[PDB]
Each structure stands twice: as C-alpha cells, then as structure tokens.
Amino acid sequence: GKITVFAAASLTNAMQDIATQFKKEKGVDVVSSFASSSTLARQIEAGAPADLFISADQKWMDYAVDKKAIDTATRQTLLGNSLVVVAPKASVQKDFTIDSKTNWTSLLNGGRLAVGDPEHVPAGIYAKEALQKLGAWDTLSPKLAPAEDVRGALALVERNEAPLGIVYGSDAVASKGVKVVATFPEDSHKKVEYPVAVVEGHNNATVKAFYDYLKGPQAAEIFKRYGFTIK
C-alpha cells in the first residue's frame, strides 16, 4: 500500500533514498512531506493524515505529543547532527572559530546571515540559542535572512544571496554548492536530536514495518552517508 512521512526538511535527501530502497526491497510506496518540523507538527495537530513524524528537535515532537497526536510509546530519538556555518563553495571565506569574540560583523561584510526562521524552525531555534549564549545575538539579529526551513536557508547560500548561513552539518553533505567554514561548539546549544514517532491512529503493520526499517541497518547506512549521527 502507501505510507506518508512528515519529515524535517534536513531529512530530504536521506529520506528520498530510504523510500527508494524500501520500495525496492518491500514493495511499499513511501511519500514524504519535507518542511520545517514546526509546520509539520502543526499540520498533524490540525488532522493531516501523516503516518510518521520525524522532527529536527525534541520541542516540536513534544508539542505534537501534548496535542494527543502521537502514538507516544513509539517515540524514540533517532538521529543527531552538528550545527554549522556554511559559505558558497566558490567563496574565498576562510575557516573560522566560533566563540564569544568571533567577529561576525566583519565576516558578513554587509551581507545577511541565512538562518532557518528562529521564531519556529528548529535550525533557527538552535542557532538563536547559540548566538544568545555567545553574546552575538543583538549584533546578528538585525542581519538575518530567515527562511521557511533549513533548506531554504541552505538555498540562499548556494545562490550567493547570503554569504554565510547556519544549517546542519548534514545539509553541507547534501549540497554541492556550499562548504563548511565553522562549527558551533556543542556546549553553545541544546543537542541537535531528531525524534521519530508513529502518528496517533496510524500504527498498523504496514506503517510499523517502515518505522522499524528506519531504525535498521539499510536506513542507518543512508543516514550516515548524508552526515547524520546514529543514536
């Protein structure tokens, strides 16, 4: 039959390849919707008939659980990731270090810093927490180029519409157009974690077999090659 997965936009390439292999080996079509985890959790609350939800943070899974929208016994942390700064591939921007004295103003040179919208996109929330911790937020908040999800922020940098952007380490792996120029210290922000859960009322043998496959070795291979860490 058919399975619908709502997945954080950073999972795009990994989930597409997983769906391909799952169809090949088991016959079932997996159709994913990719968007900010916030948008997808709100769609699920409203009644969108997703079978599985994978969030780029604990926050928006918590939100869907609190709304009684999730089969909570299935909830498990699946993946981790790093938070990075990226530049267009061709840019001459050097690697730099991120600390309380980083000269963000200098690095941007009058350009914007592409981010997932920090009002709700997990990549933006992680970014804001870090820049607040580091004392850079009041300097950088006027210079942001927010995006509907972390892949829209990635696309701004790819197109050299922003000279730097904050995206996940895995997003740099997926893109042929950017390179990593810095990594946020892990102690600057909450650990990046992706919970998966079956959506309430969607726990049937078909959906459950694909849920199990996500936690399995074929999926793990694909996730690792796309720059996710396996929990």
Distance CA 56, CA 35 (A): 10
- Alpha-carbon distance 111 to 218, whole Å? 41
Q: How many CA atoms lie within 13 A of 186 on its CB side?
A: 6
| Residue 168 assigned ligand-binding role | yes
Q: Does residue 155 share a domain with residue 87?
A: yes
- Solved how? X-ray
Judgement on whether residues 165 and 201 belong to the same structural domain of the protein: no
CA angle 65, 57, 68 (to 5 degrees): 5
CA distance 133 to 128: 8
Q: Resolution of the deposited coordinates, in angstroms?
A: 1.7
d(CA 99, CA 115): 18
- Give the domain range for residue 45: 1-80+193-231
Is 10 part of any known ligand binding site?
Answer: yes
| CA nearest to 59, candidates 135, 144, 122 | 122
Could you tell me if 74 and 121 lie in one domain? no
Contact between 77 and 231 under an 8 Å Cβ cutoff? The reply is yes
Residues 154, 112, single domain; the answer is yes
- Residue 181 structure tokens: 């120029």
Query: For residues 75 and 231, what is the distance between their CA atoms, to the nearest angstrom?
Result: 13
Q: Are 168 and 123 in contact (CB under 8 A)?
A: yes
Token pair 């016959």: residue: 27
> Both 70 and 134 in a single domain?
no
- Dihedral sign computed on CA atoms, order 218, 220, 221, 226: positive
Q: Are 95 and 184 within one domain?
A: yes
CA distance 178 to 172: 6
Encoded tokens for 134: 């580091």
- 197 shares a domain with 124: no
Question: Within this chain, do residues 165 and 110 fall inside the same structural domain, yes or no?
Answer: yes
- The reply to whether 194 sits in an annotated binding site is no
7 is in an annotated binding site: no
What token pair was written down for 23? 């169809």
**Is the domain of 138 the same as that of 231?**
no
Positive or negative torsion for Cα 102, 193, 12, 8: negative
Choose among 136, 135, 95, 82: nearest CA to 113: 136
CATH number at residue 228: 3.40.190.10
Task: Give yes or no: residues 175 and 217 share one domain.
Answer: no
69 & 106 share domain? no
The terminus-to-terminus CA distance of the chain in angstroms comes to: 29
Question: Is 188 in the same domain as 205?
Answer: no
What would the DSSP string read from start to end of the chain? -EEEEEEEGGGHHHHHHHHHHHHHHH--EEEEEEE-HHHHHHHHHHT---SEEE-SSHHHHHHHHHTT-B-GGG-EEEEEE-EEEEEETT--PPP---STT--HHHHHTT--EEEE-TTT-HHHHHHHHHHHHTT-HHHHGGGEEEESSHHHHHHHHHTTSSSEEEEEHHHHHH-SSEEEEEE--GGGSPPEEEEEEEBTT--SHHHHHHHHHHTSHHHHHHHHHTTPEE-
CB atoms closer than 10 angstroms to residue 226: 23
Q: Within its chain, how far is the Cα of 202 from the centroid? A: 23
How many structural domains is the chain composed of? Answer: 2
